[PDB]
Amino acid sequence: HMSELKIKAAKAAIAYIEDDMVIGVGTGSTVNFFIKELAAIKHKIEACVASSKATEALLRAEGIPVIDLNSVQDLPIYVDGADEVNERGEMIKGGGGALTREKIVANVATQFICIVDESKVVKRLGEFPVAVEVIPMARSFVARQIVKLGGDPEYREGFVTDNGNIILDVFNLSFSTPMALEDSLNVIPGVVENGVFAKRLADKVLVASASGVNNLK
């Protein structure tokens, strides 16, 4: 029961929330269970920073106060999921299309806690595609540049990010040097951000399985 696993991972992250903290909140189904857990201790936290408009709506619907990242000097914790994560804390993210604000909030946060069920853990990144956020008028050009990097880009038809851009989901990229790959995507004109998380690692990786939650990192 994957939902039961995701709930266990979510509950394990709650043990890191200290009184009066501002908490950064990711996106996706595992994070959404965490939001319900956060709701039960919302009297203990100052506020949350949301990594997507969807996440903001869910927090507000719970009566969890939300503040703008530009107003936050100190963000001690960011809790988020991942599409793939390894023992090093490298991740592929962006399955849900929110990877740009995810990476921004993750970079302000001191501690990045990654919560996953067992199926997200991999020994080698790469089977899950890399979502690349792209200025819409640059889509064709960026696709061509990503092909030169050995990727196979697939336009996520109909989808528009929180930032008004499109997503190319990129298959078959090599992850031999993940930080160089992340950089090579981002320097392409028109690329806003990409789902390789190799320069900003998860600090903790909480992995929920039938036997409990294990700190992979």
Place this chain on the structure above:
Amino acid sequence: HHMSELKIKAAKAAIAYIEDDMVIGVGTGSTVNFFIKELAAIKHKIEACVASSKATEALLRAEGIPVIDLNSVQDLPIYVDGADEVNERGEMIKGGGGALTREKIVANVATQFICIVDESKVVKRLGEFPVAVEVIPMARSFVARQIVKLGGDPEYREGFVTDNGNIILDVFNLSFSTPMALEDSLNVIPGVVENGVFAKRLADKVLVASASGVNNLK
């Protein structure tokens, strides 16, 4: 000699490179706007234009010049645009007008980048004019902190929103000793969309208007 007269000379110099049935990439700004009026005179000989800004699109369309989306173009032989600074190498600082992101995209699809300037845009060394950096709005504070670590002084361009919905940090005092590495260092910052350093995509020709005429600096 008006500044306007100089920009017009540069605009007319660029028209000499336009061939029948081309798709033409078009930049932004007051010098390019004189080029748009030169293009209107030959619009029948043009296939269409690619516009680097919504303002440029509106000016092209008001001249009856056909506009097409960049995603429908693969063969873009020319891109004509100005610069805030340009040197003899064809390196440029761009983005004073806030449209540097679409400017760089179109310039990168185009085969030949023709830079048209009056003589006041030419510098021996880039750097006095600030570098516009386009930033995801909720990342403004973070990006500013990261730029300060790179040795820059970022100033938020109050009230301004780019064509893409983002804000501009105009950055002073960056070092240009390694301008390509500078351009990259800004862009790998999470939340930075693009920046006005044009060091990896050079101008292929630099047409400089002065009282004496137009000189191909490059």
